[PDB]
Scaffold this active site. Structure first.
Site, mmCIF file in Angstrom:
data_model
loop_
_atom_site.group_PDB
_atom_site.id
_atom_site.type_symbol
_atom_site.label_atom_id
_atom_site.label_comp_id
_atom_site.label_asym_id
_atom_site.label_seq_id
_atom_site.Cartn_x
_atom_site.Cartn_y
_atom_site.Cartn_z
ATOM 1 N N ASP A 153 12.379 -3.798 -26.163
ATOM 2 C CA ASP A 153 12.549 -4.584 -24.922
ATOM 3 C C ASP A 153 11.357 -4.466 -23.939
ATOM 4 O OD1 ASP A 153 13.240 -5.723 -22.436
ATOM 5 O OD2 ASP A 153 14.951 -4.470 -22.136
ATOM 6 N N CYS A 154 10.493 -5.472 -24.008
ATOM 7 C CA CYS A 154 9.803 -6.073 -22.871
ATOM 8 C C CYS A 154 9.459 -7.537 -23.218
ATOM 9 C CB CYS A 154 8.558 -5.256 -22.509
ATOM 10 S SG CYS A 154 8.004 -5.656 -20.846
#
Ligand SMILES: *SC[C@H](NC(=O)CC[C@H](N)C(=O)O)C(=O)NCC(=O)O
Length: 212
Positions: free
Chosen positions: A19-20
């Protein structure tokens, strides 16, 4: 010379992406250009000391363009799509007006302490206002081709499909006839498909970021 990029390593799995979705924008424009780059997986739970010499906030994404640093992915996209050797793409059409409301509102959907059940009653009309004119152009969230609105939103839609799918698998109806088929295009091209994170490593990246 050249392009060096610093991006999210997965939580517990430093050899892969997690997650980014802001890092996934930078991979997307480089792979649309097919331009040569070099990628550096930054653990955010244990940051290298020299990473603060590249990013003064300690955040990812950050890049070097000709060895000179640029932080914040909407600024990184702005400079890559204006000042690079392949054709510039920094042209925002009318779709940026609705897409700049979708841009934070779909991050707030993944931070819905303030109810998602009430927020979604605006998101369906945000998607209709975009989709009603995108069905005249056909293929991409900025119109006939990828420009700034796809670079603002495309990885965030796949991140919603994965991470919201873990607790509230929110359906896009066929009335949103561009949006429902555009999500299927995220599993295609160089530009979307190469950028696809490992889906457990999106969910286990996003859980504490319901809070943080
Ligand atoms: S995605 C993880 C964090 N980055 C951002 O939120 C970037 C926002 C910018 N405006 C952008 O690039 O678009 C991040 O790096 N967090 C640091 C941490 O320690 O987790």
């Amino acid at each position: 010379m050249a392009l060096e990029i610093c991006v999210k390593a997965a939580v517990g799995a430093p050899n892969i992406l997690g997650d980014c979705p802001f890092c996934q924008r930078v991979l997307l424009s480089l792979e649309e250009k097919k331009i040569p780059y070099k990628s550096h997986l930054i653990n955010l739970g244990d940051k290298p000391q020299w990473f603060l010499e590249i990013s003064p906030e300690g955040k990812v994404p950050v890049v070097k363009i000709d060895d000179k640093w640029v932080a914040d992915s909407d600024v990184i996209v702005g400079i890559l799509e204006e000042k690079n050797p392949e054709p510039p793409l920094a042209t925002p059409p009318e779709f940026a007006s609705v897409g700049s409301k979708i841009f934070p509102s779909f991050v707030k959907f993944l931070k819905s302490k303030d109810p998602n059940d009430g927020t979604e009653q605006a998101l369906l009309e945000e998607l209709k206002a975009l989709d009603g004119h995108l069905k005249v152009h056909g293929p991409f969230i900025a119109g006939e081709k990828i420009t700034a609105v796809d670079l603002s939103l495309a990885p965030k839609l796949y991140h919603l499909e994965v991470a919201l799918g873990h607790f509230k698998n929110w359906p896009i109806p066929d009335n949103l006839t561009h949006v429902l088929n555009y999500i299927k295009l995220l599993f295609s091209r160089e530009s979307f498909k190469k950028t696809r994170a490992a889906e457990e490593h999106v969910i286990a990246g996003w859980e504490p970021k319901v809070n943080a």
